[PDB]
Design an enzyme around this catalytic site. Structure first.
Site, PDB file in Angstrom:
ATOM      1  N   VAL A  47      38.090  27.079 -24.162  1.00 36.51           N
ATOM      2  CA  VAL A  47      39.513  27.397 -24.274  1.00 36.51           C
ATOM      3  C   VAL A  47      40.152  27.419 -22.899  1.00 36.51           C
ATOM      4  CG1 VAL A  47      41.256  29.088 -25.109  1.00 36.51           C
ATOM      5  CG2 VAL A  47      39.130  28.659 -26.408  1.00 36.51           C
ATOM      6  N   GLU A  49      22.200  31.011 -17.511  1.00 32.12           N
ATOM      7  CA  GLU A  49      22.280  32.200 -18.348  1.00 32.12           C
ATOM      8  C   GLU A  49      20.907  32.801 -18.731  1.00 32.12           C
ATOM      9  OE1 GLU A  49      24.830  30.353 -21.244  1.00 32.12           O
ATOM     10  OE2 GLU A  49      26.603  31.443 -20.537  1.00 32.12           O
ATOM     11  N   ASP A  85      35.951  33.916 -16.842  1.00 30.99           N
ATOM     12  CA  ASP A  85      37.261  33.317 -16.697  1.00 30.99           C
ATOM     13  C   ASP A  85      38.148  33.900 -17.753  1.00 30.99           C
ATOM     14  OD1 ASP A  85      35.466  31.230 -18.277  1.00 30.99           O
ATOM     15  OD2 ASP A  85      37.517  31.190 -19.069  1.00 30.99           O
ATOM     16  N   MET A 121      31.306  29.816 -27.280  1.00 35.01           N
ATOM     17  CA  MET A 121      31.010  28.593 -28.030  1.00 35.01           C
ATOM     18  C   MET A 121      29.745  28.685 -28.899  1.00 35.01           C
ATOM     19  SD  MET A 121      32.163  25.827 -25.154  1.00 35.01           S
ATOM     20  CE  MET A 121      31.914  24.421 -26.257  1.00 35.01           C
ATOM     21  N   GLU A 122      29.035  29.843 -28.915  1.00 35.24           N
ATOM     22  CA  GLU A 122      27.830  29.954 -29.724  1.00 35.24           C
ATOM     23  C   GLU A 122      27.800  31.164 -30.618  1.00 35.24           C
ATOM     24  OE1 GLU A 122      27.386  29.948 -26.091  1.00 35.24           O
ATOM     25  OE2 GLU A 122      27.634  27.756 -26.266  1.00 35.24           O
ATOM     26  N   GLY A 130      34.920  33.760 -22.114  1.00 36.09           N
ATOM     27  CA  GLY A 130      36.300  33.756 -21.655  1.00 36.09           C
ATOM     28  C   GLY A 130      37.021  34.992 -22.129  1.00 36.09           C
TER      29      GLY A 130
HETATM   30  N1  LIG Z   1      37.272  29.813 -21.680  1.00 31.14           N
HETATM   31  C1  LIG Z   1      36.131  29.713 -22.356  1.00 31.14           C
HETATM   32  N2  LIG Z   1      36.095  29.154 -23.584  1.00 31.14           N
HETATM   33  C2  LIG Z   1      34.925  29.084 -24.249  1.00 31.14           C
HETATM   34  N3  LIG Z   1      33.740  29.524 -23.862  1.00 31.14           N
HETATM   35  C3  LIG Z   1      33.775  30.098 -22.647  1.00 31.14           C
HETATM   36  C4  LIG Z   1      32.678  30.626 -21.957  1.00 31.14           C
HETATM   37  C5  LIG Z   1      33.169  31.038 -20.803  1.00 31.14           C
HETATM   38  N4  LIG Z   1      34.508  30.832 -20.695  1.00 31.14           N
HETATM   39  C6  LIG Z   1      34.903  30.274 -21.865  1.00 31.14           C
END
Ligand SMILES: Nc1ncnc2cc[nH]c12
Ligand SMILES: Nc1ncnc2cc[nH]c12
Ligand SMILES: [Ca+2]
Ligand SMILES: [Ca+2]
Ligand SMILES: [Ca+2]
Ligand SMILES: [Cl-]
Ligand SMILES: [Cl-]
Ligand SMILES: [Cl-]
Ligand SMILES: [Cl-]
Ligand SMILES: [Cl-]
Lengths: 233, 233
Positions: free
Chosen positions: A155, A14, A200, A176-177, A80
Site C-alpha cells: 500500500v 525478517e 513505513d 501482505m500475509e 505498514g
Molecule cells: N505499506 C505496506 N503495504 C503492505 N505491506 C507492507 C509491509 C510493510 N509496509 C507495507
C-alpha cells in the site's frame, strides 16, 4: 510432550535474526519455503521463511501445520502503519485479521469476508497475553493492539489508503500475509497471533524508504517473538 | 506406477459430477478440504473440493501435491467471461494465469506480478494439447484459449471490469482460485491447466444469475476434465 511453536516471516531479513539464535538447527526446503527447526531459549520452534504475499504464506503455513506439526503460529516481520499513534519501529499485535482486498459482497458477505469463511480471524487470547508480557521485557517499546488487514498489495497511494479506511476503519496496520496465515490457521483450528513492527506509513515515499527501516522493524518484531517463545517454554 | 491426476474445483457443485463417476472411491477431509481418491475411466485421480478464493485454493493445492502425491493439476469449475466470443457454458482453457489483484509495481514488478514470483504462470503445453483434444470430443462446444485472471473478488461491476481490462487487456475470463493454484504448482514444479466454463459475464446481473448457470458451467467443464483424464491416464 512440549508445544511446537511455528514462527512465520516472509523475507530473509525478517527471519535471519531468529534463525541465528536457534540451537540444534536443522534445515528443510520445500515449495520455495525454508524451514529452520530447533530450539529458541529451550522452546521447540519451526521458523518458516514463506515468501511474500497471500499464496506464498498459505502454502508455507499449510506445510508448517500439516508437515511440521506446529501447535501455534506466530507471524513476525514488517507492516505498514495506519494507526496514527504508531511510529516507525513500533510493535503491532493483532486482535483480529481481515482480508482488505476480498470482495464477495455480490453474495451478501461483508466487505473483506471471503466466501465460506468468517469475516474476521480472531487471534488467540493466550498468545495475545503472551505478547503483552513479551512487550514489557522490551525497553520502552510502544505497541498498538488491533485489526491487521492484509492484501496482495504494497500500500503506497492515498486512494488505496482511503479504500481500506472506508471499509476497515479500526485498521492499525497493513501487510501482505497475515490474513492468509490466519485463514489457514482457522481452517486447521490452530491458534495464531501477528506480532509485527512498523516500517513505513504506506504512502508514496514508503516503497523507497522501506529498505532503510526493514532492519528496525525486523529487530523489534524479532525481539517480541524471542521474548514470547521463551515465555511459552 | 501411473500418473496421478489432481483435479481441483472450489464448490460442491463443481466437483459433484466427477465425484459420482469415480470408481473405488475413498474420501478424506483436512483443513476444510475434501479429497476424493479413486479412478476415472481407469485414470488415477484425486479430486479436491478446495473452497472458494485464493487462500483456500492454495491450502488445498499444497495438500494435494505434498500429501496426495499428484503429478499434474487440472482446475475445473465456473468462471466469468471477458472475451466477447464467449457464451454461457462455453469453455475457457488457460494459456497462462495472472493475479489481477496483485500490485507491487512500486518495487519494479509488473502489474499483477507478486514479489518473488514470475509475472505469469504458464500452463503446461502437454496439458493444453490434451485439453484441445478433449474439446474436440465434445459436441460442438466453443472454447477460447488465453489468459485467465484471478482475484479475491466476484467481479460484477463495470469499474472492476474496466480496471482488469486496463491492466490485462488480453484477459479472457476471471475467477477466484486459478492464480493460487498456478502459483502453488509453480512453487512445487507441478504442471497445471485451467479448464473452466462460463457462468456469467462478470456484470451487474451476474450475482443473481450465477446460480442458474453454475450447473451448466459445471457440466461443460466436467465433461472436458473427464475427456482429458481418459487421454492422460
Ligand atoms: N505499506 C505496506 N503495504 C503492505 N505491506 C507492507 C509491509 C510493510 N509496509 C507495507
Ligand atoms: N464474475 C465472476 N467473478 C469471479 N469469479 C467468477 C466465477 C464465476 N463468475 C465469476
Ligand atoms: Ca511437557
Ligand atoms: Ca547461532
Ligand atoms: Ca531506499
Ligand atoms: Cl530480506
Ligand atoms: Cl492499543
Ligand atoms: Cl456448490
Ligand atoms: Cl480463500
Ligand atoms: Cl481461442
Amino acid at each position: 510432550n512440549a508445544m511446537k511453536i511455528g514462527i512465520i516471516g516472509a523475507m530473509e531479513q525478517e527471519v535471519a535474526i531468529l534463525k541465528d539464535k536457534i540451537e540444534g538447527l536443522s534445515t528443510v526446503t520445500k515449495a520455495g519455503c525454508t524451514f529452520y527447526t530447533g530450539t529458541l531459549n529451550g522452546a521447540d520452534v519451526v521458523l518458516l521463511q514463506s515468501g511474500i504475499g497471500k499464496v506464498a504464506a498459505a502454502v508455507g503455513t499449510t506445510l508448517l501445520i500439516a508437515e511440521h506439526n506446529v501447535d501455534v503460529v506466530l507471524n513476525t516481520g514488517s507492516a505498514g502503519g495506519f494507526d496514527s499513534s504508531l511510529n516507525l519501529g513500533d510493535v503491532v499485535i493483532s486482535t483480529e485479521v481481515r482480508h482488505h482486498d476480498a470482495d464477495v459482497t455480490a453474495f451478501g458477505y461483508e466487505m473483506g469476508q471471503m466466501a465460506q469463511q468468517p469475516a474476521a480471524f480472531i487471534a488467540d487470547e493466550k498468545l495475545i497475553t503472551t505478547a503483552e508480557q513479551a512487550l514489557t521485557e522490551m525497553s520502552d517499546k510502544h505497541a498498538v493492539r488491533g485489526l491487521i488487514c492484509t492484501g496482495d498489495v504494497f500500500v503506497c497511494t492515498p486512494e488505496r489508503q482511503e479504500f481500506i479506511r472506508t471499509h476497515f476503519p479500526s485498521v492499525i496496520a497493513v501487510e501482505m500475509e497475515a490474513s492468509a496465515i490466519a485463514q489457514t490457521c482457522h481452517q486447521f483450528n490452530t491458534p495464531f497471533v501477528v506480532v509485527r513492527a512498523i516500517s513505513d506509513v504506506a504512502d508514496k515515499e514508503s516503497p523507497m524508504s522501506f529498505d532503510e527501516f526493514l532492519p528496525l522493524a525486523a529487530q523489534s518484531s524479532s525481539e517480541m517473538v524471542l521474548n514470547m517463545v521463551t515465555l511459552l517454554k
